């Protein structure tokens, strides 16, 4: 794709290190600060159940595909202004590759 695809062992530690404080990926997994990210890909932004999303995350309604997802992670507030996810973003393509790839796989 336009987005490459990378190491999923790496993506894994990046996720455990940078996203885990707020998010789970396992199925049924509990929302935290952030929604449970299971079956993220293929869903529209703002759909996780029994999680309260800023109207901004709902009103953007984008399908989460590895591509719009990568633009998002680079800078969550530029992408969905008003979003309340407090992340600075991943400025590194590998990182983005490595993570997405991991996610791809973890949120099946």
């Amino acid at each position: 794709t336009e987005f490459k695809a990378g190491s999923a062992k790496k993506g894994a530690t990046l996720f455990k290190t940078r996203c885990l404080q707020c998010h789970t990926v396992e199925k049924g997994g509990p929302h935290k600060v952030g929604p449970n990210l299971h079956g993220i890909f293929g869903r529209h932004s703002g759909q996780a159940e029994g999680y309260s999303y800023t109207d901004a995350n709902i009103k953007k309604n984008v399908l989460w595909d590895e591509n719009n997802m990568s633009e998002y992670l680079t800078n969550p507030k530029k992408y969905i202004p008003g979003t309340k996810m407090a992340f600075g973003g991943l400025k590194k393509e590998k990182d983005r590759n490595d993570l997405i790839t991991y996610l791809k796989k973890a949120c099946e």
């Binding site: 990046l14 290190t17 940078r18 404080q21 707020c22 600060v33 407090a86 992340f87 600075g88 400025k91 590194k92």
Partner: protein, 294 residues
């Protein structure tokens, strides 16, 4: 004789732009070495260095303070309440070689200003003019705070820096950043979830979590919330003091406000003890990497 007088002296014909360049270097490098401390980055540690180099000030005789860039002398450098800041010192030695004209004092503080702005905190006006001072101006170890205390040690420790209750509560919101490291200080854990982005999480956590006091492995006690955060005695003490607690509630409610008090305080912190002639330039507001297309 009255106290010592420290006049800020601009670096020989330098100007904003010369200083926006230093920022950019620091800023970028924070973008580059992002793996530090499990990907927290060098953000938290540089803001902590900024605070420690300034926190030695004594308003009664005007000694200590940012002015002299004395943290660079072993005495100071080796102060045990300074453990872990060597990591912040190293991160800027490179940049110092790049710009050898800027004084040590101007670098350590510009650095904390960069880190706050770069982590999406408010803008912090900043001024230059700190001048380097002989090894003799090095403050003895022990002018920095203990963690293991209560609201009253806090209120008083701060009158020495000339800060009030609102300024002390605002400054502490910086505890949203980083975490404590047991090898550095006997405490362990983060205050919150977004350790590298500047918000008012510090205050919502303080009041919405469920804290239980407990002992760490270093054998010290701390307050742990079920959620994985910790609070030091001195932080918890902020909600046990009726007066600290209403400022804490203000701030948990209104980030702008916090953002405005913090900037006023942080800068007041960094300029303490320094006299600016009436001819010095107005404080600078630097642009972020974001604002510059980066």
């Amino acid at each position: 004789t009255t106290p010592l007088v420290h006049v800020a002296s601009v670096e020989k014909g330098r100007s904003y732009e010369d200083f926006q360049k230093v920022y950019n270097a620091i800023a970028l490098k924070l973008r580059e070495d992002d793996e530090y401390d499990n990907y927290i980055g060098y953000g938290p540690v540089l803001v902590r260095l900024a605070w420690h180099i300034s926190g030695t000030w004594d308003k009664h005789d005007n000694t200590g303070g940012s002015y002299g860039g004395t943290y660079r002398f072993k005495k100071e450098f080796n102060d045990p309440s300074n453990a872990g800041l060597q990591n912040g010192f190293k991160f800027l030695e490179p940049i110092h070689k790049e710009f050898p004209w800027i004084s040590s004092g101007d670098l350590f503080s510009l650095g904390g200003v960069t880190a706050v702005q770069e982590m999406q905190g408010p803008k912090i006006p900043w001024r230059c003019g700190r001048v380097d001072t002989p090894e003799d101006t090095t403050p003895d170890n022990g002018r920095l705070p203990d963690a293991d205390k209560d609201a009253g040690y806090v209120r008083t420790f701060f009158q020495r820096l000339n800060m009030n209750d609102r300024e002390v509560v605002a400054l502490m919101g910086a505890h949203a950043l980083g975490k404590t490291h047991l090898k550095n200080s006997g405490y362990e854990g983060p205050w919150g979830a977004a350790n590298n982005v500047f918000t008012n999480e510090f205050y919502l956590n303080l009041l919405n979590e469920d804290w239980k006091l407990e002992k760490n492995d270093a054998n010290n006690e701390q307050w742990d919330s079920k959620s994985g955060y910790m609070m030091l005695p001195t932080d918890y003490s902020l909600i046990q003091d009726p007066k600290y607690l209403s400022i804490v509630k203000e701030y948990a409610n209104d980030q702008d406000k916090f953002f405005k008090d913090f900037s006023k305080a942080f800068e007041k912190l960094l300029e303490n003890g320094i006299t600016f002639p009436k001819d010095a330039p107005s404080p600078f507001i630097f642009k972020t990497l974001e604002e510059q297309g980066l």
